Design a protein around this ligand. Structure first.
Ligand SMILES: CO[C@H]1/C=C/O[C@@]2(C)Oc3c(C)c(O)c4c(O)c(c(C=O)c(O)c4c3C2=O)NC(=O)/C(C)=C\C=C\[C@H](C)[C@H](O)[C@@H](C)[C@@H](O)[C@@H](C)[C@H](OC(C)=O)[C@@H]1C
Ligand SMILES: CCCCCCCCCCCCCCCCCCCC(=O)O[C@H](COC(=O)CCCCCCCCCCCCCC)COP(=O)(O)OCCN
Ligand SMILES: CCCCCCCCCCCCO[C@@H]1O[C@H](CO)[C@@H](O[C@H]2O[C@H](CO)[C@@H](O)[C@H](O)[C@H]2O)[C@H](O)[C@H]1O
Ligand SMILES: CCCCCCCCCCCCO[C@@H]1O[C@H](CO)[C@@H](O[C@H]2O[C@H](CO)[C@@H](O)[C@H](O)[C@H]2O)[C@H](O)[C@H]1O
Ligand SMILES: CCCCCCCCCC[N+](C)(C)[O-]
Ligand SMILES: CCCCCCCCCCCC
Ligand SMILES: CCCCCCCC
Ligand SMILES: CCCCCC
Lengths: 155, 1033, 144, 48, 96, 48, 48, 48
């Protein structure tokens, strides 16, 4: 890897907006990934650092970057209820029907965690409601198993 | 009392003989150690959950044990941590003075009752309760040089042929094996298991049934049939002994007739229990033995017995086995004792030369040569009675008190020689008159000196334990010195001293001694002419005194504070921290470079490098490792550039080039359980169930706010590990039930193969050892190998793991800390240069109040003790001044006169601060205790001047200036003699460069510089203090 | 009599009888205490806002106040005048018989699905030559 | 219901309990308040 | 239970004996391993030693050996009592 | 003094071929020749 | 029994010294205790 | 220490009589204690 590329991973994970800004000016690799395949955009979407996601996407970061298990930053933003990041990523061309190595779409992750606002944005951007994972379970099958009455009406 | 022993010299000799016999008996039966028990009693509960993550260990083991730690007496706090290596360390710190055996048994008993609440895997592994102590007498390394034994083979030989004999060695308190004995390793193969329709559950089931002790019974046992002639015990199934027997374990029989053995599906070998640690000594495999000194044992005798026991095992060692010593405190203790004994004998030699230079007779010089060793021997008898030990603190306490011991002998002898030369009285009658002039003053001096050191012993915590060693040692020696000066010395002066004619001041002699007396008498008259002129303009010297007090107050703040000076013990640490997620192989590459640096760039100083990969420090994971550097002798490393401080700074600078690896070197502290001075130990508690992620954000908020104040806070770093990416695997309960796969079968297959399962015990060469089932390395490295494991369903079909599980990446803590039963984040730091520890703690408390709702805080360790030690400090200083004043008020029979003596305190401190500031030393405990011995000896000199000047005004009816000029003239010779021998006596301590010089320089410089000014200033300022005080009142 | 030694002697004898006691009694927790017969003091806890019920206050007291007070030196015994929360599963024999299930099936499913599993590690020791990944495996955890 | 340990001081233990309760007070939920309906230590403190 | 003297000594006696190191005022330690399964480790302390503190110190050292002992031995329970070798008296009971 | 003892060698291959559980063999041998402690009972108001 | 015999010579040695020193301090002399200590063998011969 | 005139009696079962028989002996004792109000007052069991 690179000296600046590995520093960017730590800055995007902690949330140091000023360090990320200085690293962008110095030319830190936006497509630098760690051992598990997580880029600085993955870490910003997981830890909920909205401004860092916007700064990374502006500096040509792969919005559809996938780790060793097929998970993209949209999967992490929808799974951890980061509504503002879900919209920012979807605006920048994030695949709303992205399937990981288990066939799980960002809609399945948002339905399992009960994020109504995130599910509504995902469906608005064209998320397939009839998408099945490796076990043939759709987002509606997850909502009825959890007992989310409000989510079952949307799906 | 002195008159009673002047007429009875044989009684005085009998008392001295008994003191010498009691002191000699104590010297042989006193335990020798480097440092005594200073740290408070701490008990550490350590448990192990093989293959479990930090949260599994915390939520099933740590929380359960912490919840049952109730009803235990004298508990201060309870810190604990669960790491991703399946380990928990619950340390319970008790109040200082608690019976450590009672504290341990109370903790152990509460753990026994909490045992049925822990998981079966933790109960099987067992939980150990020990006394928290990083104080090892020595660390014995066992290496292999011919490359025939691996690190696990060496560890097995030590555990079965060395550890037991070393534990039974005289004075050995505890032995810690740095390694694991053999373990029957069953390296399973999922491809071979799937071929014969078998799972790791069947492997566990077969080993448990075919490797077990079976109770069978008796042949002709009671109640028997009447007429039985034979009674015999029945043995049925015993534990397996060899790898061949484990390989022959029958798993199943095929329908065609062929047998399925354990060797067909797994690789059976004798390996180690734990593979997380790779220990190397100079590149070759190594194991260790952490030997601790027993309670009341002699360190020098124990180390000699350990080496003698190791020499007996020498002809039985296998090919290539060698015994190395990477860590040993014994050479440091041997030098710490020898240098003290050297200084004590040198002081007697110097006192002999000083006494013969002034008095010029061999009869007088023999008196201190008898009195000093009697007092020194007697101090050992008082130390033995008080339960004390011969350690670095008690040995240097006698060195600091040598100035007080020789002064008591000089003051008495000189006064008899002065009375004989000024009146012509016979040795017996002159001794009664001389003793009458100083007996009350010697008793008053003993009371004033008691009021200086006795309150110092009443400090609390670790600091109080260190001060207690100096207080008892100095008070006991000072009390015995006054007793000898009132019992033995007056008897020796009345019987051994030679008569001096009236008027004979030695000026009529010929040679060098005749010139010295004519020069000293001329200098004595020049001294009185100078003091007389100084008494005419006292106002000028009062202003000059205030300049000294201001200079003393300034130099006290401009002196760095410390507890114990960091000495070149011969060893130092080197921390290697790779990024979060690095493998054991990647840490070994960095450790090899670190070892190569010490064996090439510093090959003239470094003797050996103990590279321990996966060392318990920093979550003891694969991304951590230490390099214990052992250096050559202090004689073989001359100069400041070849010392630990210079080698450490050169190494840290060179290791900065190693990218993707945080490598830094650092010296070990004088007392491991102390840490650093001017530093703090903060704890960020979660008092509202906020969670780990919320507590991490709160810690980051406090860390960023601490960085905004570099003027008050420096090096504010968290003492923990950051969250790492982990493999979250979800077992689908619906798919598992549809296929007919048991959930327990799935978790057993996943746990035993990827984490390792402890099945049962076996006997290897008459030794009970563990049996572990685990997948072979080739089949448990990557997420792809998950799908290669097949679990048998109820219908007989083999279902792979990929059919009933989905996996994703997430972040989780590899080390969860908990303080006082609540989740916590330990934060280290220190005060910026110029700011006190109390100021740095106050800012930390202010920044903590701005943290989110539910985030609390508390002070632990050194901070907890510094909070309670700072409260006692003002009262102990005040009590010292009150009792010192009261003792002088009774002696002088005045409420104003004691002030003349108390004004000499800054005269001795100004020189001590100047000597330490110009040298570059710190305000350590040796400097603080050395300050009290300088203040005490200067007050001792001032007491004898003021007492003589007052008695001349009271009894002889002399004027204020007349009696003051007479008193300083009489006390000039005894003051100049004691100082000449004390300054020359502590001279080798200042110039000590080699072994153990860090403590000798702190004791030596803080006393030499102090005594120079407390002699030059006191001879001219004491007459002023007495005149100014008597004129004012 | 030294109460510390008296407790150690009673405890040593109890440890011999402990394995003979039923498993239900062992898992509940046997306690040995050297406390006085009378109460030193009673620390009442109320809610002036009415936000918390008697059961809610009792849970907060036990989960956030009791353990620290029990560890305080000089505190022989602490009696919670209420009860700490517990995951209550209130069985219905009509619904259980409807799906051919028993309280035994409920206990079996709770033990199997509410379990903290030790799954091991990826690239754990002893690892292969050329391994670059080291991560803890996280299987089922205790339900919250 | 706090029971005093065997041989322990009644006043020193009550002071330690009140010091521990003070650390919990700043993190109490809305409305939570500590009351003292039974205490044998104020009588000892006053009568002496 | 049911273990012969050799197994009892190798798996139980040796394990406890190796952990009885560094106990204060210890004079000597005799131990028996019966073919029934009984282990009896007697540690005699110097005259004047607090017998209660000696029991506490032995119990603390036993905690370190307890995990390494077999599960069948822990199921019986290990007792640490103050011992005396001779009988003060024998009280016989008969039926006339 | 050293006493003679009766050693019994259970063949694991023969027992598994016949369908006899090794746990049942060890229980049958131990309970009959040595005596097995099953559980407790109440004899005149006392557990035995 | 072995310990009793090993400490026996050291016991007699310190007892003789303590008595001698006590007599020297009480009677203020060296000839007085030395002449009195010469009587010890006159008693020990009869005891033996 | 007590309540000046209060006493604490313990009726023991020393022959395995059982709970039912011990209750009958306690009732017999309680009836006889009531017959002496001149010496015994408030004699009652401390059980359920
Ligand atoms: C003065 O203290 C020093 C040495 C004492 O000498 C020893 C012999 O005594 C120790 C004691 C009393 C500990 O408690 C340690 C400790 O907690 C450590 C580490 C190691 O790693 C240690 O190494 C020790 C350690 C020693 O070597 N941290 C941990 O386990 C954890 C879970 C995390 C650590 C994170 C970082 C990496 C660490 O914070 C670092 C930034 C420094 O702060 C320390 C390495 C300190 O170095 C310095 C130079 O400041 C030492 C505490
Ligand atoms: C377990 C191992 C133990 C090892 C240690 C053993 C313990 C040692 C036991 C004590 C030994 C003391 C020996 C003292 C001998 C001194 C010389 C004696 C000479 C003598 O008898 O003259 C007396 C007085 O002496 C005088 O007038 C001049 C004497 C001056 C005082 C004594 C000074 C020398 C003492 C040195 C002791 C050093 C001891 C070192 C350990 C008699 O005269 P009188 O009184 O009968 O007169 C009668 C008319 N008036
Ligand atoms: C006379 C008045 C002044 C008294 C000052 C002198 C006494 C101060 C020292 C205290 C006694 C030292 O303690 C005593 O020292 C001897 C060495 O001589 C030690 O002896 C030990 O030291 C070395 C260490 O390598 C070994 O070679 C030796 O085999 C071992 O037994 C013992 O540990 C102890 O019996
Ligand atoms: C850096 C160089 C420093 C020089 C040495 C300083 C050493 C400090 C020790 C104190 C020495 C004082 O030395 C002494 O001072 C006093 C001043 O009060 C002198 O006294 C003389 O001057 C004073 C003031 O005019 C007169 O009142 C007095 O009558 C006269 O005799 C002494 O003749 C001299 O011997
Ligand atoms: C050495 C043991 C103690 C000796 C005590 C003897 C004291 C007797 C003193 C008698 N006298 C005062 C008359 O000399
Ligand atoms: C004849 C008068 C002599 C004075 C004795 C004073 C003794 C001083 C001791 C002070 C400590 C309380
Ligand atoms: C009359 C005073 C005698 C003092 C004797 C001291 C004994 C230690
Ligand atoms: C008053 C005694 C102080 C000792 C040094 C801290």
């Amino acid at each position: 890897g690179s000296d600046l590329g590995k520093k960017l991973l730590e800055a995007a994970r902690a949330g140091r907006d000023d360090e990320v800004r200085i690293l962008m000016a110095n030319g830190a690799d936006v497509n630098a990934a760690d051992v598990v395949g997580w880029t600085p955009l993955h870490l910003a979407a997981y830890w909920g650092h909205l401004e860092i996601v916007e700064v990374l996407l502006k500096n040509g970061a792969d919005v559809n970057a996938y780790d060793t298990l097929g998970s993209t930053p949209l999967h992490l933003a929808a799974h951890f209820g980061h509504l503002e990041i879900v919209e920012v990523l979807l605006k920048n061309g994030a695949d709303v029907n992205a399937k990981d190595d288990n066939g799980i779409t960002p809609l399945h992750l948002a339905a399992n965690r009960g994020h109504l606002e995130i599910v509504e944005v995902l469906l608005k951007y064209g998320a397939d409601v009839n998408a099945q994972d490796k076990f043939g379970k759709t987002a509606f099958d997850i909502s009825i198993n959890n007992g989310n009455e409000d989510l079952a009406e949307i799906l | 009392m002195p008159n009673f022993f002047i007429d009875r010299p044989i009684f005085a000799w009998v008392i001295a003989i008994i003191i010498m016999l009691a002191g000699g008996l104590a010297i042989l039966k006193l335990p020798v150690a480097q440092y005594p028990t200073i740290a408070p009693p701490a008990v550490t509960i350590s448990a192990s959950y093989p293959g479990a993550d930090a949260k599994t260990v915390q939520d099933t083991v740590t929380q359960v044990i912490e919840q049952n730690m109730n009803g235990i007496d004298n508990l201060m706090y309870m810190s604990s941590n669960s790491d991703s290596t399946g380990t928990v360390q619950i340390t319970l710190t008790f109040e200082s003075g608690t019976d450590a055996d009672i504290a341990q048994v109370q903790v152990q008993n509460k753990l026994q009752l909490a045992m049925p609440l822990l998981p079966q895997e933790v109960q099987q592994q067992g939980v150990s309760v020990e006394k928290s102590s990083s104080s090892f007498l020595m660390v014995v390394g066992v290496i292999n040089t011919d490359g025939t034994m691996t690190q696990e083979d060496i560890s097995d030989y030590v555990a079965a042929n060395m550890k037991d004999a070393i534990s039974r060695t005289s004075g050995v308190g505890d032995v810690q094996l740095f390694g694991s004995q053999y373990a029957m390793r069953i390296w399973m193969n999922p491809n071979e298991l799937n071929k014969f329709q078998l799972t790791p559950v069947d492997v566990i089931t077969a080993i448990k049934a075919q490797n077990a002790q079976v109770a069978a019974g008796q042949l002709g046992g009671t109640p028997p049939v009447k007429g039985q002639q034979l009674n015999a015990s029945i043995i049925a199934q015993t534990r397996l002994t060899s790898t061949e027997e484990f390989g022959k374990i029958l798993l199943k029989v095929n329908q065609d007739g062929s047998r399925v053995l354990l060797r067909d599906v797994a690789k059976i070998e004798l390996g180690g229990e734990n593979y997380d640690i790779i220990a190397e000594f100079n590149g070759q495999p190594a194991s260790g033995l952490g030997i601790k000194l027993a309670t009341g044992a002699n360190a020098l005798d124990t180390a000699a017995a350990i080496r003698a026991e190791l020499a007996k095992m020498e002809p039985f060692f296998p090919s290539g086995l060698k015994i190395v010593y990477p860590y040993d405190t014994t050479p440091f203790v041997k030098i710490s004792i020898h240098e003290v004994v050297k200084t004590l004998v040198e002081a007697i030699i110097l006192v002999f030369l000083v006494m013969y230079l002034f008095l010029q007779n061999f009869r007088a010089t023999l008196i201190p040569t008898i009195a000093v060793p009697v007092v020194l021997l007697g101090t050992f008898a008082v130390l033995a009675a008080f339960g004390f030990s011969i350690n670095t603190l008690t040995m240097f306490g006698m060195v600091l008190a040598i100035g007080l011991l020789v002064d008591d002998a000089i003051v008495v002898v000189e006064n008899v020689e002065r009375v004989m030369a000024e009146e012509g009285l016979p040795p017996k009658e002159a001794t009664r008159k001389s003793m009458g002039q100083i007996q009350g003053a010697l008793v008053g001096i003993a009371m004033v000196l008691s009021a200086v050191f006795v309150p110092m012993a009443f400090f609390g915590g670790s600091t109080g334990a260190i001060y207690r060693q100096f207080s008892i040692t100095i008070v006991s020696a000072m009390a015995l010195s006054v007793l000898v000066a009132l019992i033995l010395t007056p008897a020796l002066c009345a019987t051994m001293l030679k008569p001096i004619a009236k008027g004979d001041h030695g000026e009529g002699k010929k040679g060098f001694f005749g010139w010295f007396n004519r020069m000293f008498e001329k200098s004595t008259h020049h001294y009185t002419d100078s003091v007389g002129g100084i008494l005419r303009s006292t106002g000028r010297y009062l202003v000059l005194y205030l300049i000294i007090v201001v200079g003393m107050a300034y130099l006290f703040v401009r002196l760095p504070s410390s507890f114990l000076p960091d000495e070149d013990q011969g060893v130092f640490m080197t921390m290697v921290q790779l990024p979060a997620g690095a493998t054991q192989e990647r840490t070994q590459k960095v450790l090899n470079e670190v070892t190569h640096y010490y064996l090439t760039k510093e090959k003239n100083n470094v003797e050996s490098v103990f590279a321990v990969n996966g060392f318990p420090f920093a979550g003891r994971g694969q991304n951590t490792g230490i390099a214990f550097v052992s250096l050559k002798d202090w004689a073989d490393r001359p100069g400041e550039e070849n010392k630990v401080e210079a080698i450490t700074m050169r190494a840290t600078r060179a290791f900065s080039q190693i990218k993707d690896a945080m490598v830094f070197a650092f010296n070990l502290p004088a007392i491991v359980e102390l840490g650093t001075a001017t530093g703090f130990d903060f704890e960020l508690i979660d008092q509202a169930g906020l969670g780990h992620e919320k507590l991490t954000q709160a810690r980051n908020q406090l860390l960023a706010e601490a960085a905004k104040h570099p003027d008050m806070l420096t090096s504010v770093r968290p003492n923990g590990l950051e969250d790492t990416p982990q493999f979250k695997i979800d077992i689908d309960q619906e798919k598992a039930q549809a296929l007919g796969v048991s959930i327990n079968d799935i978790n057993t297959t996943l746990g035993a193969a990827w984490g390792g399962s402890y099945v049962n015990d076996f006997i290897d060469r008459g030794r009970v050892k563990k049996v572990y089932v685990m997948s072979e390395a080739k089949y448990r490295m990557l997420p792809d190998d998950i799908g290669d494991w097949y679990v048998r369903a109820a219908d007989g079909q083999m279902v792979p793991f990929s059919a009933f599980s989905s996996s994703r990446w997430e972040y989780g803590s590899p080390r969860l800390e908990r303080y006082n039963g609540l989740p916590s984040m330990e934060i280290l730091g220190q005060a910026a240069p110029g700011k006190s520890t109390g100021e740095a703690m106050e800012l930390m408390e202010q920044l903590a109040s701005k943290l989110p709702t539910g985030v609390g805080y508390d002070w632990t360790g050194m901070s907890y003790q510094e909070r309670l030690s700072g409260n006692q400090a003002p009262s102990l200083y005040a009590i010292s001044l009150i009792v010192v004043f009261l003792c002088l008020a009774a002696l002088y029979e005045s409420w104003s006169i004691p002030f003349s003596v108390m004004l000499v305190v800054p005269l001795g401190v100004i020189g001590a601060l100047l000597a330490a500031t110009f040298r570059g030393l710190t305000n350590d405990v040796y400097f603080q205790v050395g300050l009290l011995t300088t203040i005490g000896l200067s007050a001792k000199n001032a007491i004898l001047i003021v007492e003589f000047a007052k008695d001349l005004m009271d009894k002889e009816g002399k004027g204020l200036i007349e009696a003051t000029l007479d008193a300083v003239r009489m006390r000039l010779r005894p003051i100049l003699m004691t100082s000449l021998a004390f300054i020359l006596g502590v001279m080798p301590l200042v110039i000590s460069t080699g072994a153990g010089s860090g403590a000798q320089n702190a004791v030596g410089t803080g006393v030499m510089g102090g005594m120079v000014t407390a002699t030059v200033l006191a001879i001219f300022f004491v007459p002023v203090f007495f005149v100014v005080v008597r004129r004012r009142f």
